[PDB]
Structures are given as structure tokens and as C-alpha cells.
CSV table of N, CA, C and O in Angstrom, one decimal:
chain,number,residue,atom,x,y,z
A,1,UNK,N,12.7,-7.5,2.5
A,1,UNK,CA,13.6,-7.1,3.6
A,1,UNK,C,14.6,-8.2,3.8
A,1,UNK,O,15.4,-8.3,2.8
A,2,UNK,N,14.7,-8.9,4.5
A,2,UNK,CA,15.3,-10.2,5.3
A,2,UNK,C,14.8,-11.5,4.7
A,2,UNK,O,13.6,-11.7,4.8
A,3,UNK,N,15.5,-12.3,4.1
A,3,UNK,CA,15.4,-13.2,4.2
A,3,UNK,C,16.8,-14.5,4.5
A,3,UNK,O,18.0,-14.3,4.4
A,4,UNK,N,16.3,-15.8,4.7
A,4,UNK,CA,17.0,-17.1,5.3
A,4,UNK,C,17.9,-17.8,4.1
A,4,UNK,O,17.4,-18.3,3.0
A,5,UNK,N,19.2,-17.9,4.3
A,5,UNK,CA,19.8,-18.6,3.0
A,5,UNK,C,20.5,-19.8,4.1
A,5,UNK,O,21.0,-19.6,5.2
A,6,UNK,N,20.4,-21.0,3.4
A,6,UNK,CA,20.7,-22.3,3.9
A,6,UNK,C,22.0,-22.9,3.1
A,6,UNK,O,22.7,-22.1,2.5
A,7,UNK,N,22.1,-23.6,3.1
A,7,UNK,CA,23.1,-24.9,2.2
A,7,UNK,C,22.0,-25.7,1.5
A,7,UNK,O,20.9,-26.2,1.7
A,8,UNK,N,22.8,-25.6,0.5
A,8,UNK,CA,22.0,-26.3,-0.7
A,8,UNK,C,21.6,-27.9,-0.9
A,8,UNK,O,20.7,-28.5,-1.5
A,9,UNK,N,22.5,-28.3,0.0
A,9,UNK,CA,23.4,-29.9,0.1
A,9,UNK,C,22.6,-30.0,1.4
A,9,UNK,O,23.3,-30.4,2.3
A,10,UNK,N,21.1,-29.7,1.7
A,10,UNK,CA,20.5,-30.1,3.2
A,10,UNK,C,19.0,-30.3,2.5
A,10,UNK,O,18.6,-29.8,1.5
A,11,UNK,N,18.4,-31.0,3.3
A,11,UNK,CA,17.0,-30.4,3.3
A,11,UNK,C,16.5,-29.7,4.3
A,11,UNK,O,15.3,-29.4,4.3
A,12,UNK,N,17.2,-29.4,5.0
A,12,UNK,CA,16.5,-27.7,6.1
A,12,UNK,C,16.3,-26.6,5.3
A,12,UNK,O,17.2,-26.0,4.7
A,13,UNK,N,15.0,-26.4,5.2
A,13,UNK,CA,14.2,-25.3,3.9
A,13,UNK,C,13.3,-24.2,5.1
A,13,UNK,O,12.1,-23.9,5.2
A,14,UNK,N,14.1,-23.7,5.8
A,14,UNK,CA,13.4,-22.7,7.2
A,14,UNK,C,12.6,-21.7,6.4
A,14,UNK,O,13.1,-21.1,5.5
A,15,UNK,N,11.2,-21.5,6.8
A,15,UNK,CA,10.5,-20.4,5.6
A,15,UNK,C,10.3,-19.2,6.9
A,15,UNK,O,10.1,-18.1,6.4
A,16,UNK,N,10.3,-19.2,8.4
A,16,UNK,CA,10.1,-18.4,8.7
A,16,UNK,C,10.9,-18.2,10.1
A,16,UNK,O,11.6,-19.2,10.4
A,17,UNK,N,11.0,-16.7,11.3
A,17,UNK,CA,12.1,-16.8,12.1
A,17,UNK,C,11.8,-18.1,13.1
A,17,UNK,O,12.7,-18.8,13.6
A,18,UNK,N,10.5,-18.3,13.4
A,18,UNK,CA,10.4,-19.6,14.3
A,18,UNK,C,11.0,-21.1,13.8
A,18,UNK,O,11.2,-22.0,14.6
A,19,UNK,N,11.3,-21.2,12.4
A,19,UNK,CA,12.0,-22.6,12.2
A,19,UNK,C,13.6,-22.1,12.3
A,19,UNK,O,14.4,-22.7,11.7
A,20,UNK,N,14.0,-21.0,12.9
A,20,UNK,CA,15.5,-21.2,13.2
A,20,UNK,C,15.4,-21.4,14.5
A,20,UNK,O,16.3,-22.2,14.9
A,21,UNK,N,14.5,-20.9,15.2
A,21,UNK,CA,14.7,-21.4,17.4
A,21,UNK,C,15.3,-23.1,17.3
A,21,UNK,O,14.6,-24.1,17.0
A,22,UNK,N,16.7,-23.0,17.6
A,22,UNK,CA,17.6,-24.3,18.0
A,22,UNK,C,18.7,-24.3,16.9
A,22,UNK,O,19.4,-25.2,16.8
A,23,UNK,N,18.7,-23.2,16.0
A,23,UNK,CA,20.0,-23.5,14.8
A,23,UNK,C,20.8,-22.1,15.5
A,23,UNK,O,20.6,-21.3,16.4
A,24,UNK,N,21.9,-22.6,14.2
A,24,UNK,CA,23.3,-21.5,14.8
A,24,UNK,C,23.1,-20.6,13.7
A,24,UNK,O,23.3,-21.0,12.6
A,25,UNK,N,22.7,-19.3,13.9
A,25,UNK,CA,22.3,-18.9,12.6
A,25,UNK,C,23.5,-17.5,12.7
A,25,UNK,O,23.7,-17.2,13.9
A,26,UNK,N,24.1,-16.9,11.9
A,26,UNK,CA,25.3,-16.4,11.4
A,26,UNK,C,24.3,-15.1,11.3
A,26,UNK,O,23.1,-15.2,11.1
A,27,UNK,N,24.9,-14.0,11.4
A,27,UNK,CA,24.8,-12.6,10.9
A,27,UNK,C,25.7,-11.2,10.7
A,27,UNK,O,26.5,-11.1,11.7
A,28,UNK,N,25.8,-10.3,10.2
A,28,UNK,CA,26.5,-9.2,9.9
A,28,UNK,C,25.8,-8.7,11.1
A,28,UNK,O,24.6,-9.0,11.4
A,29,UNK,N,27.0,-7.6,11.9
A,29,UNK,CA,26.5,-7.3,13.4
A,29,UNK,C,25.9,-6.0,12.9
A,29,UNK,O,26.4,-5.5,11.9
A,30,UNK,N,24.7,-5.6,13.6
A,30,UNK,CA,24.2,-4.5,13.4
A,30,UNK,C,23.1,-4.4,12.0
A,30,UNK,O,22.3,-3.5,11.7
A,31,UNK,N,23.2,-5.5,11.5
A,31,UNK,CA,22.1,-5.0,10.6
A,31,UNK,C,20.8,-5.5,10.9
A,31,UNK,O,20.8,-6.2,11.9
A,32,UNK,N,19.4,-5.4,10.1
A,32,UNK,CA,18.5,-5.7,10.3
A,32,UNK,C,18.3,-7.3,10.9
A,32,UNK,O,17.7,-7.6,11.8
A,33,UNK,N,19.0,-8.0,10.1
A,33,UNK,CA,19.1,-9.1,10.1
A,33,UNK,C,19.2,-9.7,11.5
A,33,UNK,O,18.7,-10.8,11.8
A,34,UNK,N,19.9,-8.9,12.2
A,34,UNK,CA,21.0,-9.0,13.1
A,34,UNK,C,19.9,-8.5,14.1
A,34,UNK,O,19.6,-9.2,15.0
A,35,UNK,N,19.3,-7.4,14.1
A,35,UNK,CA,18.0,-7.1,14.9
A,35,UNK,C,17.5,-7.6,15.2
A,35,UNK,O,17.4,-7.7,16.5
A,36,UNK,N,16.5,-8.5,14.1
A,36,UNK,CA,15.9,-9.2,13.7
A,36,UNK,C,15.8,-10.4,14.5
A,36,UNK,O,14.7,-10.6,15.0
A,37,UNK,N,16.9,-11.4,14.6
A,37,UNK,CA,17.1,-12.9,14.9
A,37,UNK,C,17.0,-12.6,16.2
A,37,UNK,O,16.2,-13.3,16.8
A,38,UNK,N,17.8,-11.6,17.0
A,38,UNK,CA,17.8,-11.4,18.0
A,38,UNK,C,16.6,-11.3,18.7
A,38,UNK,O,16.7,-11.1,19.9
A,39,UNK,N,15.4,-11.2,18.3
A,39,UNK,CA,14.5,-11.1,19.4
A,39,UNK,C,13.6,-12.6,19.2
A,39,UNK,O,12.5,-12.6,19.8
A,40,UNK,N,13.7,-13.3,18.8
A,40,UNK,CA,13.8,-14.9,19.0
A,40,UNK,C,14.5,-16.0,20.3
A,40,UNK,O,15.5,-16.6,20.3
A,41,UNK,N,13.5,-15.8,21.2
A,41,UNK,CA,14.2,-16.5,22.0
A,41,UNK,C,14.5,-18.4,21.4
A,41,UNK,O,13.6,-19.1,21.0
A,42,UNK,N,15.8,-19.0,21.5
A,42,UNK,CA,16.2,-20.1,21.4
A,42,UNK,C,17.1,-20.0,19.9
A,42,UNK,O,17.7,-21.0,19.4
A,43,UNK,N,17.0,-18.8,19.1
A,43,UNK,CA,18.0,-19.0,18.2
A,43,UNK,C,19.2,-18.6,18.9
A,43,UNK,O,18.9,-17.8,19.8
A,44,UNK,N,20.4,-19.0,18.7
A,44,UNK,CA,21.9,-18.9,18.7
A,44,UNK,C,22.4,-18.2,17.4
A,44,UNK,O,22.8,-18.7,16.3
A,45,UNK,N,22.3,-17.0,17.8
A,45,UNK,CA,23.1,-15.8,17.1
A,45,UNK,C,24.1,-15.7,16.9
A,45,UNK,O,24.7,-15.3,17.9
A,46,UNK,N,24.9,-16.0,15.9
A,46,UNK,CA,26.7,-15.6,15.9
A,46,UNK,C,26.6,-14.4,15.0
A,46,UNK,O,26.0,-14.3,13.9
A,47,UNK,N,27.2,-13.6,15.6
A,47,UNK,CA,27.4,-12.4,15.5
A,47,UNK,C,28.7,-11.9,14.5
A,47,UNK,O,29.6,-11.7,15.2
A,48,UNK,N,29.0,-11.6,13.0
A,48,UNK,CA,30.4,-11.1,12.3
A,48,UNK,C,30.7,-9.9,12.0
A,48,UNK,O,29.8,-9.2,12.3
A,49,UNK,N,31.4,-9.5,11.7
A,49,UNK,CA,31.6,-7.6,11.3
A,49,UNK,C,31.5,-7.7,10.3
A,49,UNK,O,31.0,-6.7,9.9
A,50,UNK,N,31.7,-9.0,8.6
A,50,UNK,CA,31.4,-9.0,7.4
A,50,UNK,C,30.1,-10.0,7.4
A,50,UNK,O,29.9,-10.9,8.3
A,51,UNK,N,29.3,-9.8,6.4
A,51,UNK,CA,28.8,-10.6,6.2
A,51,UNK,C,29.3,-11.8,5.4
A,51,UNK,O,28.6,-12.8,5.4
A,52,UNK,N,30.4,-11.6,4.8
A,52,UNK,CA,30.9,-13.0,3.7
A,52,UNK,C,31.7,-13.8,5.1
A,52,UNK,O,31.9,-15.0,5.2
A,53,UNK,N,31.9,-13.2,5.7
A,53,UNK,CA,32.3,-14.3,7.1
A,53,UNK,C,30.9,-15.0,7.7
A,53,UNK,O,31.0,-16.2,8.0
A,54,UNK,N,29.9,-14.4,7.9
A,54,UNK,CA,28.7,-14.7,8.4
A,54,UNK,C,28.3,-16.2,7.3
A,54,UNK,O,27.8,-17.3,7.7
A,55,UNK,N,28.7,-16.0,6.0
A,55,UNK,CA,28.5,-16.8,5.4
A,55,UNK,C,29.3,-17.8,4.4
A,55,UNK,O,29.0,-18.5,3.4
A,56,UNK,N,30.7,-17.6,5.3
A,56,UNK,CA,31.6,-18.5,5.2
A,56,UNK,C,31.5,-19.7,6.8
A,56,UNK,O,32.1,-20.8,6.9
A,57,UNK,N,30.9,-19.3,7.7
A,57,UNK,CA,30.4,-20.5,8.4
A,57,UNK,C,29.4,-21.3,8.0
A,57,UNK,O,29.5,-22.5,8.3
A,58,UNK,N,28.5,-20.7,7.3
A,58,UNK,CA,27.4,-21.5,6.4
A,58,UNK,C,28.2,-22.4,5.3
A,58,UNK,O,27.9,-23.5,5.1
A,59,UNK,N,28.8,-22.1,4.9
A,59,UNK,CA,29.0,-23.0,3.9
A,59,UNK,C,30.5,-23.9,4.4
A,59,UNK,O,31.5,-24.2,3.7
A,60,UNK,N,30.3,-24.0,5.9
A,60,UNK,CA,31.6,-24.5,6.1
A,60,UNK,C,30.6,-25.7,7.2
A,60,UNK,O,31.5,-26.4,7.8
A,61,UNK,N,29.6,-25.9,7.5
A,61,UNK,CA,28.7,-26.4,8.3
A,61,UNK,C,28.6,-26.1,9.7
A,61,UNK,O,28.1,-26.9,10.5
A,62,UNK,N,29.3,-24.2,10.2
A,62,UNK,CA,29.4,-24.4,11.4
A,62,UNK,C,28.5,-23.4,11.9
A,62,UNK,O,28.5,-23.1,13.1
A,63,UNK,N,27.7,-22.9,10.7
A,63,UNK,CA,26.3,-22.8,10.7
A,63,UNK,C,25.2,-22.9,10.3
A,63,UNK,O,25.3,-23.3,9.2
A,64,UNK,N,23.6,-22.9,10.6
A,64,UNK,CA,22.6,-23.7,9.6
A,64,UNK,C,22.1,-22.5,8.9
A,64,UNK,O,21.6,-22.8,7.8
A,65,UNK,N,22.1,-21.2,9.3
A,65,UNK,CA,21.9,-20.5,8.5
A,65,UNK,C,22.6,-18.7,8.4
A,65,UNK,O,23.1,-18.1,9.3
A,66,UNK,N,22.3,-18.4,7.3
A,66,UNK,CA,22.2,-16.6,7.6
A,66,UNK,C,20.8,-16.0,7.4
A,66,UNK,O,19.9,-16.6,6.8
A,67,UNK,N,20.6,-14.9,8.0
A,67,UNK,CA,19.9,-13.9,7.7
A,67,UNK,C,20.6,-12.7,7.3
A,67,UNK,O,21.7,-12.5,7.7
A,68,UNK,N,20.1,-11.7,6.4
A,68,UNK,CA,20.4,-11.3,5.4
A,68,UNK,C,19.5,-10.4,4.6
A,68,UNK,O,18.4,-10.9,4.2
A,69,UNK,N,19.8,-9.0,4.2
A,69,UNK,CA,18.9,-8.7,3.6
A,69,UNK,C,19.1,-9.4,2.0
A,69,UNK,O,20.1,-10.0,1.5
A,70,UNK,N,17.7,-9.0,1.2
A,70,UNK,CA,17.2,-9.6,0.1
A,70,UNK,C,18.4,-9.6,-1.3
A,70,UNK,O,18.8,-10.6,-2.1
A,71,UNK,N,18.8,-8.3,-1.3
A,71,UNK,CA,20.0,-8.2,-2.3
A,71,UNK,C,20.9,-8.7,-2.3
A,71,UNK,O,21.2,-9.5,-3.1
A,72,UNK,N,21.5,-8.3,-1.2
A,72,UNK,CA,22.9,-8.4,-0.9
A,72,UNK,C,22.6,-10.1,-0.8
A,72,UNK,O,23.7,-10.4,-1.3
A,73,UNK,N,22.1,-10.9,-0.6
A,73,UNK,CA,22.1,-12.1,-0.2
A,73,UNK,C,21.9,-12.5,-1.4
A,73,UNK,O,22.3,-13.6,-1.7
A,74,UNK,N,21.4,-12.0,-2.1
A,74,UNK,CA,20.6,-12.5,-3.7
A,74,UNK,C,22.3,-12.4,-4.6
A,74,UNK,O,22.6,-13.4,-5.2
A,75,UNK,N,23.1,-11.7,-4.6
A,75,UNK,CA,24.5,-11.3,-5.1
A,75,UNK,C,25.3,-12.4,-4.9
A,75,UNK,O,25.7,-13.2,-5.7
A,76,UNK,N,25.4,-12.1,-3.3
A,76,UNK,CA,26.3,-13.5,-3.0
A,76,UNK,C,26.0,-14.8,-3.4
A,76,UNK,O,26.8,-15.3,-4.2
A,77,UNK,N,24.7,-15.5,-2.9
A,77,UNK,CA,24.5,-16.5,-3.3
A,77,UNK,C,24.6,-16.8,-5.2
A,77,UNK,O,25.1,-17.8,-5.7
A,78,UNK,N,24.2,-16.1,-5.7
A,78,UNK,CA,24.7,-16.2,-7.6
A,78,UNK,C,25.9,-16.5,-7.3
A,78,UNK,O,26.3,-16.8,-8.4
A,79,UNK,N,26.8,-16.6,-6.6
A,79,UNK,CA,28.1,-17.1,-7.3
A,79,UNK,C,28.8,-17.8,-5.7
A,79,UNK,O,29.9,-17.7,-5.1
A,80,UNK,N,27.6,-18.3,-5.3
A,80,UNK,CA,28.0,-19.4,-4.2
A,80,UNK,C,26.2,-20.5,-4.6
A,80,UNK,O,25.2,-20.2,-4.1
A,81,UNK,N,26.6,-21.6,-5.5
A,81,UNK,CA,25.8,-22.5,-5.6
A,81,UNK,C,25.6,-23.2,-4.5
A,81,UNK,O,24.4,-23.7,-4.4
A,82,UNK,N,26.6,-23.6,-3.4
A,82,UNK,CA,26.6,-24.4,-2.4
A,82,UNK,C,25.4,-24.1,-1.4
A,82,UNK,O,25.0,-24.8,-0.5
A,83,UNK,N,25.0,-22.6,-1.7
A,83,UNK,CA,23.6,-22.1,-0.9
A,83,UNK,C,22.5,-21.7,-1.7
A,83,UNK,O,23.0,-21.6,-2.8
A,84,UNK,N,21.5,-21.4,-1.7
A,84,UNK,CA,20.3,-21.1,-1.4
A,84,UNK,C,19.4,-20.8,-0.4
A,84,UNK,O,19.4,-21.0,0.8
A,85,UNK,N,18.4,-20.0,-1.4
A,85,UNK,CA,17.6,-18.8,-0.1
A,85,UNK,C,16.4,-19.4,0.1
A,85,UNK,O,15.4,-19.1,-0.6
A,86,UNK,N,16.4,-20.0,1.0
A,86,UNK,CA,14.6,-21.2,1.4
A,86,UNK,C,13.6,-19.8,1.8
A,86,UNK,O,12.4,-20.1,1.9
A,87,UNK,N,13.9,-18.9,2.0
A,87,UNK,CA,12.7,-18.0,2.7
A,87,UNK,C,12.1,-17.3,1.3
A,87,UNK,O,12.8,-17.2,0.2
A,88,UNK,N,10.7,-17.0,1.4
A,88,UNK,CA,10.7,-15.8,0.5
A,88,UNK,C,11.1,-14.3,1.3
A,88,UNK,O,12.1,-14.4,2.0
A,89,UNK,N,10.6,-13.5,1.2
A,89,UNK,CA,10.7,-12.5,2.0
A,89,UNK,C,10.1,-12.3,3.4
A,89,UNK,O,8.9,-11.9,3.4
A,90,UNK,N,10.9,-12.8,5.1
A,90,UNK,CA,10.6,-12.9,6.1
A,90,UNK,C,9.5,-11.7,6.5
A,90,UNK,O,9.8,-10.5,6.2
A,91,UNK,N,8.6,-12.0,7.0
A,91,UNK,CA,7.3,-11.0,7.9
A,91,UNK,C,8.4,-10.7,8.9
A,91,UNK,O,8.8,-11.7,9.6
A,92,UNK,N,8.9,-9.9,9.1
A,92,UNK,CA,9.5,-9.2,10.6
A,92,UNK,C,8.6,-8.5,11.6
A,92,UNK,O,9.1,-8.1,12.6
């Protein structure tokens, strides 16, 4: 389903939704992802209409992470090295 992609260039390795409560975590509005984070009290949700915007804050440091489903995140990140996906597939 969902899983956490980080910056590569960190050691913040978040494996589940409780190690994001206190990060700025980026998302495509409306999708699971986006569901998802939101019922986490203490994460900071930034909310995008794309997801390559969701994850042009991540790789810009003015987020610590995305959530994201599995593929689509598996795509992007292949041809953005500056990230990687510390989660396996999130328990929702």
C-alpha cells in the first residue's frame, strides 16, 4: 500500500506512521497516503495537488518525508537517487 520515502543524504530511516509524529511530511491531497498521515496526531501534513511537488519539498529539505503509494513512489524514486524508501510496506 503506502509506504515512507526519505532523503538519502540523512540518517532518518522512519519504518512506521509513529516515527513521522514531529516531521513535515508532504503528500498528494486525497490519496491514501494523504488519509492515512492524517489520522496521526503530531505529524504536520503538507498537503499538494501533484505528488512530484509533494516530493520536490523532500528533496529540497523543506520536508522530511513523503507518503506515497508503493509504485508510484517506486517510479519516481528510480530516477531521483537523492531519495529512498526506508519503509517496507506501512501496516495502515
Amino acid at each position: 500500500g503506502q509506504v515512507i520515502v526519505v532523503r538519502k543524504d540523512s540518517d532518518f530511516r522512519p519504518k512506521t506512521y509513529e516515527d513521522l509524529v514531529g516531521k513535515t511530511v508532504a503528500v498528494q491531497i486525497g490519496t491514501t497516503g494523504d488519509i492515512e498521515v492524517s489520522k496521526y496526531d503530531g505529524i504536520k501534513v503538507v498537503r499538494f495537488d501533484k505528488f512530484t511537488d509533494a516530493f520536490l519539498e523532500l528533496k529540497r529539505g523543506r520536508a522530511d518525508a513523503v507518503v506515497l503509494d508503493s509504485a508510484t513512489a517506486r517510479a519516481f524514486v528510480a530516477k531521483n537517487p537523492d531519495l529512498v524508501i526506508s519503509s517496507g510496506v506501512l501496516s495502515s
